[PDB]
Design a protein around this ligand. Structure first.
Ligand code: ADP
Ligand code: MG
Ligand code: ZN
Ligand code: ZN
Lengths: 623, 558
DNA sequence: ATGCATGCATGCGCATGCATGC
DNA sequence: GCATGCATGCGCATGCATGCAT
């Protein structure tokens, strides 16, 4: 080892070799130890799984290392650069000793993770330079691949001999003399015969959610190498484990003088997606290791019970009283509809997601529901009234930080792809901003045509909108359309519209007061697993009975809505019904859509608009 | 001219012979500094006044030289007071120990910083009056911080390792830009003439925290018809992370130029920050309008409170807002369109050091975990009103425009003033106070007598209960805010009833009434604040009764 | 001794904010 | 209640002049 360190190579190697065979955790449960016998050593089983599959990478938790011993953990945290190759060679030796004749592409590498989490980046000090650090953040920019040279190829002008030079300390010393003809300065570098590696630059936005008073959000720059390139996408919330670096800045490109103040930099070695509070992402849904057979059996047994649907509506948000219909609609939005493909038909993309609007007085808990949905669902975005512009959404023109690449930069709606976008104070939004939503809510695509840029982007986003009456009060003398004041085209694209009113019931007031005062003084993991399994396994289909039921429901809806004063019906609404039915099919884990789902969708649609209580010929609601 | 050896010896003996404070403070400080239990030492020039005062003048004239002399003296004194090894030693300590085990720059082995505190007899100056006469001297400046830069490392001493030898080369840095070395000046390489090339090392090199900040003059010291001037201050060492934008600070430092014109800057040494219902005794009446302000200042257990006062002109609403702004530690005051749009929320601006873009917040961002005051609320723009509503209901601001995509945390309590009701204010604000004026001869005479007494004696009329100063009120509020009471389970059966009947009454008065769960939440918050005022762990009935009375009085203002 | 990076306008393209006119 | 006219900041590229580090 280099001077200034107390790390001993042989001792660390022996310690890691012993640890890979001796470590056993009794507290580990089958909830996360999938396909591994807890009674047997864990990391040996992981190495066996690696041998079976052939993946040359192994993941090691830092907490396990600390539990085994503290000296090794401290040495690894302090000096990763020397410790990591020792771990790699020890793992390679053990793997080749236990499993001969195995075939791979290169030696096995080790990636540590779950080190001690720094609460805030701005709390770091120069003492922490070149140390292992873990971060939590959201990706907003990813650059293109950059090649970095590792070996250099040199050719002679006269004799044309082939030589190779390996980079050392980041600098390549080209030979000044030949090897066959001994001619001075006769060697020329060939770029295309060299060896290159991938490098990518990513940008993170930090949000530890426990910021001090008056602290603004922070932006961090990360660099990824090799296979880690393109493992994340913009809008994803990830945990990054890596190393902290400091790089000097030149005064100018053509002068060797550099500034005394250095530049911060971070190198990435590990990514983590799982979160203890949010739902599973799309990356996990494309794997088979998520669910153990016991949990699958438990979920299948639970799904057979009839009330589980309502049970789910009870388990969505226990902090908000009642509102069963709203919770059921939110659950149906979360499940979603069947994503059919219509490329051969020429009709184009078909929206399989549900958009929901909530209208009511300001003294309502719609904002709490929006905040809960935003915090619960990954890839969620939040906007409020006039704070967002038409150009703020979609994309806007910005130059590359170095050259004139004309780099389009994504907006809130694009970052909400395959996610949920919540809008509060939908009334204050201008017509220019609603013009974007007009295309987004239906075509699921955005067309951009500006100077030197012509492109189409995917905008598969489901929208939760909140609105208010004219005078912040629901005037009984005015009709629903008058109170809402929204265009028919905009309202027609919403699958469900929930009108929240105050009936002034004494029992309701007593219950609300009791719940609010008591606030002073199902398992989430089970719900997450059930939702993921339902969403990633079953593609519902509908039968003839559902067809006839939907036709009858459509004609009945048109007859009901023919009267003036109420919200009229359009053929598009019919499609909405189908989506809702499909959502119900995902609730019961049924691949076939039955009449029960259609009836439930019709009931929800009828109850959402309060059409039963509303006077059909005057448009005035009176309970 | 004078020899520096004698003055160095005088400093050394002063650091060892200042028992007259009874414990030997400097001995303990040196022991902590030698055992790596303290990383900063401050020297009082008022303490030096006991010794020869000529040293004080010399330091005030040539501060940097004497700072270096003090650093050298402390470094030389450190070995004497050492008793034991380092209990827990870090990477830099490991390098220092290894280097000692095996000339080295003094600052490389040094791991402490020294600073001077200005004498109390030295009167603070004004930013406008610091000029060429003060270059190189020690000055004290009082001002307001406007911009602060992020913390970044800065090189002090650079370490190079040779390609063909184990020798390590050290290069001190005393310039903003430095030229890296190439060839190895080691004796082995010089003798062999191998021509090895050096490589920089980040681990062996020494780094210090660096920060930029800007200060402006107070509005009181600005001359007639002029504009406040700005100054730039550099922060290094443990002084970092002390100053924040919007704070009133006092900084003692050195005035130095940068290279026959030159640009000036300041190097900081010390930075410092600058019934009970007696709010604004200058204003007669409004007895029931002052307890609400006290409860707003105390706050609930989200437990934020927002208050709006609507009134006819001439009842002096603005003075109460100004008093609230002055009393609160973190406070902002807005008059109208002069701070609209960019004044609130935040904006993106270039950096002084990094040369890139960073987000600077507005009045709402600065007033985080504080109190904000708005005057002429009805005249604000629609966007500002929507932002205020978002702050009141959600406590976070969402910005999504070209180049900006952020969510800012703003946990501030809003006090607003307005003239003459729209349903938005009733549905959103927790408390509305309508102040109406009607002519009464006796009240008019009393108010006129009070106003004339205020104008004549320049002080409020005396009474049985004397008011209190701002410092005592601030300390009392800080002490009160510590506790967090809890509502007992049984009292629910009371409170719920107190709610339900109330709403029933609101159902009887169909003319103009508004009730919801928001009123119950406001009642609970007020009761918790009142219980906190008594430092009681369990909320009592009297707090609930007082909160109900206050809410009824607010409602009974037509 | 010579060729180049930089300081100082200026056009280009754009978004954003304030005022008003139908 | 909203689109447009009139500044103004932002980010950028481009052209003209000059002053000296390799
Ligand atoms: N109750 C009062 N006691 C003492 N002075 C008062 C009172 N009401 C009004 N004043 C005086 O009248 C003036 C009102 O001016 P201002 O505070 O601008 O009114 P507003 O805030 O309503 O616009 C103040 O200077 C204040 O000295
Ligand atoms: Mg006033
Ligand atoms: Zn050759
Ligand atoms: Zn050497």
């Amino acid at each position: 080892v280099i001077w200034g360190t107390d790390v001993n190579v042989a001792a660390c190697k022996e310690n890691f070799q012993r640890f890979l065979q001796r470590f056993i955790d009794p507290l580990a449960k089958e909830e996360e130890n999938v396909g591994i016998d807890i009674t047997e050593p864990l990391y040996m089983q992981r190495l066996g799984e690696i041998n079976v599959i052939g993946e040359p990478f192994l993941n090691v938790n830092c907490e396990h290392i600390k539990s085994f011993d503290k000296n090794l953990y401290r040495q690894l945290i302090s000096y990763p650069q020397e410790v990591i190759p020792t771990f790699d060679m020890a793992v390679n030796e053990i793997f080749f000793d236990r499993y001969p004749d195995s075939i791979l592409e290169h030696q096995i590498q080790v990636r540590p993770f779950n080190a001690l989490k720094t609460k805030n980046m701005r709390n770091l000090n120069p003492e922490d330079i070149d140390q292992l650090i873990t971060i939590s953040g959201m990706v907003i920019r990813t650059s293109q691949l950059i090649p970095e040279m590792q070996e250099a190829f040199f050719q002679c002008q006269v004799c044309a001999h082939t030589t190779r030079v390996e980079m050392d300390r980041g600098r390549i010393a080209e030979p000044s003399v030949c090897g066959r003809c001994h001619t001075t300065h006769s060697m020329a570098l060939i770029h295309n015969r060299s060896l290159f590696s991938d490098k990518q630059m990513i940008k993170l936005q930090e949000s530890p959610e426990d910021m001090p008073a008056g602290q603004t959000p922070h932006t961090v720059i990360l660099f990824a190498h090799n296979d880690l390139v393109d493992k994340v996408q913009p809008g994803d919330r990830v945990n990054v484990t890596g190393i902290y670096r400091a790089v000097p800045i030149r005064v100018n490109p053509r002068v060797s003088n550099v500034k005394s103040v250095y530049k911060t930099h971070i190198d990435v070695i590990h990514y983590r997606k799982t979160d203890a509070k949010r739902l599973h992402g799309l990356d996990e849904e494309a794997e088979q290791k998520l669910f153990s057979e016991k949990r699958v059996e438990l979920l299948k047994e639970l799904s057979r019970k009839p009330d589980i649907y309502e049970r789910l509506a009870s388990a969505l948000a226990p902090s908000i009283y009642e509102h069963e219909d709203i919770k059921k609609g939110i659950l149906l939005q979360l499940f979603g509809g069947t994503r059919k493909d219509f490329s051969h038909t020429g009709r184009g993309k078909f929206r399989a997601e549900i958009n929901i609007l909530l209208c009511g007085d300001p003294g309502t808990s719609k904002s709490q529901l929006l905040q809960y949905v935003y915090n619960l669902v990954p890839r969620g975005q939040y906007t409020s009234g006039k704070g967002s512009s038409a150009v703020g959404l979609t994309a806007y023109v910005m130059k590359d930080p170095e050259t004139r690449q004309l780099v389009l930069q994504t907006g809130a709606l694009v970052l909400s792809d395959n996610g949920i976008c919540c809008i509060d104070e939908f009334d204050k939004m201008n017509e220019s901003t609603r013009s974007v939503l007009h295309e987004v809510m239906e075509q699921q695509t955005l067309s951009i045509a500006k100077a030197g840029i012509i492109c189409q982007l995917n905008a598969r986003t489901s929208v939760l909108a909140a609105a208010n009456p004219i005078e912040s009060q629901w005037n009984p003398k005015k009709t629903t359309i008058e109170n809402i004041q929204l265009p028919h085209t905009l309202l027609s694209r919403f699958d469900l519209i929930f009108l929240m009113l105050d009936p002034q019931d004494e029992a309701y007031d007593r219950r609300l007061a009791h719940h609010l005062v008591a606030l002073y003084y199902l398992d989430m993991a089970v719900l997450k697993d059930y939702i993921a399994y339902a969403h990633s396994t079953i593609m519902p289909r509908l039968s003839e009975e559902a067809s006839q039921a939907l036709i009858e429901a459509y004609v009945d809806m048109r007859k009901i809505g023919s009267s003036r004063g109420m919200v009229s019906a359009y053929p598009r609404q019919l499609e909405s019904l189908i989506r809702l039915a499909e959502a119900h099919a995902k609730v019961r884990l049924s691949n076939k859509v039955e009449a029960i789902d259609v009836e439930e969708a019709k009931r929800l649609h009828r109850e959402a608009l309060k059409q039963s209580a509303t006077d059909p010929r005057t448009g005035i609601v009176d309970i | 001219l004078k020899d520096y050896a004698l003055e160095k010896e005088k400093v050394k003996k002063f650091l060892q012979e200042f028992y007259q404070d009874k414990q030997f403070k400097y001995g303990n400080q040196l022991v902590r500094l030698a055992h790596r239990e303290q990383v900063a030492l401050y020297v009082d020039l008022d303490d030096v006044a006991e010794d020869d005062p000529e040293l004080v003048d010399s330091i005030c004239e040539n501060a940097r030289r004497y700072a270096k002399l003090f650093a050298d003296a402390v470094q030389e004194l450190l070995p004497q007071y050492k008793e034991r090894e380092v209990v827990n030693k870090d990477v830099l300590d490991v390098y220092i120990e290894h280097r000692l085990m095996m000339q080295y720059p003094a600052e490389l082995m040094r791991r402490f910083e020294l600073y001077f505190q200005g004498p109390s007899s030295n009167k603070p100056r004004v930013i406008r009056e610091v000029r060429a006469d003060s270059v190189g001297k020690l000055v004290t400046v009082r001002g307001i911080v406007t911009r602060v830069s992020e913390v970044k490392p800065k090189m002090v001493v650079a370490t190079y390792t040779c390609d063909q030898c184990g020798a390590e080369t050290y290069q001190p840095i005393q310039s903003p830009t430095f030229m890296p070395l190439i060839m190895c000046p080691s004796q082995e390489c010089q003798t062999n003439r191998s021509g090895g090339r050096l490589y920089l090392q980040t681990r062996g090199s020494r780094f210090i925290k660096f920060q930029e900040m800007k200060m402006q003059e107070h509005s009181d010291q600005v001359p007639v018809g002029n504009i406040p001037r700005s100054i730039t201050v550099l922060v290094e060492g443990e002084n970092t992370r002390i100053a924040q934008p919007g704070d009133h600070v006092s900084v003692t430092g050195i005035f130095l130029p940068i290279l026959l014109l030159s640009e000036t800057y300041l190097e900081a040494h010390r930075i410092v920050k600058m019934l009970a219902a007696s709010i604004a005794p200058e204003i007669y009446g409004h007895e029931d309008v002052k307890k609400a302000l006290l409860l707003l200042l105390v706050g609930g257990v989200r437990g934020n409170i927002n208050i709006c006062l609507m009134g006819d002109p001439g009842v002096a609403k603005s003075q109460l807002l100004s008093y609230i702004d002055r009393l609160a530690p973190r406070s902002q005051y807005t008059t109208g369109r002069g701070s609209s749009g960019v004044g609130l929320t935040a904006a993106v601006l270039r950096d002084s050091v990094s040369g890139e873009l960073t987000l600077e917040g507005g009045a709402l961002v600065l007033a985080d975990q504080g109190v904000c005051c708005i005057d002429e609320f009805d005249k604000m723009a629609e966007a500002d009103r929507t932002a205020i509503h978002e702050v009141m209901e959600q406590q976070t601001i969402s910005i999504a425009k070209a180049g900006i995509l952020t969510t800012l945390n703003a946990r501030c309590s809003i006090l607003a003033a307005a003239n003459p009701l729209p349903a938005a204010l009733l549905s959103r604000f927790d408390l509305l106070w309508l102040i109406q004026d009607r002519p009464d001869r006796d009240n008019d005479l009393r108010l006129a007598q009070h106003i004339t007494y205020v104008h004549q004696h320049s002080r409020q009329p005396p009474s049985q209960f004397e008011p209190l100063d701002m410092k005592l009120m601030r300390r009392y509020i800080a002490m009160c805010r510590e506790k967090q009471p809890m509502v007992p389970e049984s009292l629910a059966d009371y409170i719920t009833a107190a709610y339900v009947e109330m709403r029933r009454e609101a159902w009887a008065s169909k003319d103009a009434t508004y009730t919801s769960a928001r009123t119950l939440l406001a009642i609970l918050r007020l009761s918790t604040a009142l219980a906190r005022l008594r430092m009681v762990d369990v909320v009592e009935k009297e707090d609930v009764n007082e909160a109900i009375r206050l809410m009824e009085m607010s409602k009974d203002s037509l």
